[PDB]
A = this chain, B = another copy of it.
Amino acid sequence: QKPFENHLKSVDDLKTTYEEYRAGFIAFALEKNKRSTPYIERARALKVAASVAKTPKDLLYLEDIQDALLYASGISDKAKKFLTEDDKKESINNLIENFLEPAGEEFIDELIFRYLLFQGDSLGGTMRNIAGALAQQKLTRAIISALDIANIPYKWLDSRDKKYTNWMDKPEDDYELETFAKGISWTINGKHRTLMYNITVSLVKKNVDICLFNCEPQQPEKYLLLGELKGGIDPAGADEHWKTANTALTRIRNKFSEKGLSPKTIFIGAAIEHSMAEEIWDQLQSGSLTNSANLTKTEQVGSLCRWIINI
């Protein structure tokens, strides 16, 4: 009856299975290896460039490698934002005095090894963002397939076009269209619906993963649904990012209610553990959350998407 009751019969219907977790970790590793090559090649290139220095101090004169030297000195690009030029030069001198000179004849590999060791945290950062985008793509693929299977045309917004205004008609074969869709728009029963991802919602003044608008492809009454989408596969992060999402959804509910609005709210997650599953179920029963789906379970995702399209 209730939307979620179509694909959820018990609390643990929401729980991610052991096989789904192993599959996710394997796919994450495959993508990590695919993404790794440019990092190793940049390290190979750095060694070629740095190798013209005959002494660690000589590295200070190869302007082409100074950013790499700052990185190898233990400064992430996130940290670099907070350092003055002096701090940066000092960090590089520390690398030269504390590690490169002491490595003596092995100073070039000392540099390359440190540059890779710290760049590994950068690749890790990149991979966490990649996992997020792939999750969004998976949900979009489920949404457009649901429209396609129902013979409902739609328009889409290309994430590459930052004016984010040119709504294009669905191509004949929308194979992999989800790779670049920032939003999807359709009409069902006369009503126009526009789904957008990662939008700043003015009433809460916070970004929201999923937003469904009552409007042909800001005005609080136009928000039909707001939802959080967690594509992480790590069970150790399941409750962590659910605690985060729950405050996000409460900020939403609080601000909208103040205005007399009750938009629908949803939570979709690939890593769902027992405790958090109990809380999601309680919220669905109490009406505080409108629907939910475990992203690794096709039938749930499909049911939720068909429901979304008909809202």
Q: Which residue of B lies closest to A81 (CB)?
A: B25
Q: Which residue of B lies closest to A279 (CB)?
A: B251
Complex Cα–Cα for A245 and B244 (A): 8
Is A116 a contact partner of B120 (Cβ separation < 8 A)?
yes
Q: Of the 9-residue stretches A36-44, A60-68, A157-165, A210-218, which lies at the interface with chain B?
A: A36-44
The A interface, classified by DSSP as helix, strand, loop or mixed, is helix
Residue A171 CB within 8 A of the other chain = no
Is B243 a contact partner of A26 (Cβ separation < 8 A)?
no
Q: Of the 9-residue stretches A6-14, A27-35, A131-139, A190-198, which lies at the interface with chain B?
A: A27-35
Copies in the complex: 2
Complex Cα–Cα for A36 and B75 (A): 12
Is A28 a contact partner of B117 (Cβ separation < 8 A)?
no
Complex Cα–Cα for A43 and B236 (A): 28
A117 cross-chain contacts in B, Cβ below 8 A: 36, 39-40, 43, 116-117, 119-120, 123
A interface residues with partner B (beta carbon < 8 Å) = 18, 21-22, 25-26, 28-30, 32-33, 36, 39-40, 43-44, 73-75, 78-79, 82-83, 87, 91, 94-95, 98-99, 110, 112-114, 116-124, 205, 234, 236, 240, 242-248, 275
CB pairs A–B below 8 angstroms (22 shown): A22-B83, A26-B87, A32-B74, A32-B118, A33-B95, A36-B114, A36-B118, A40-B99, A40-B110, A40-B114, A44-B113, A113-B116, A116-B120, A117-B120, A120-B123, A121-B121, A121-B124, A124-B124, A243-B243, A243-B246, A244-B244, A247-B247
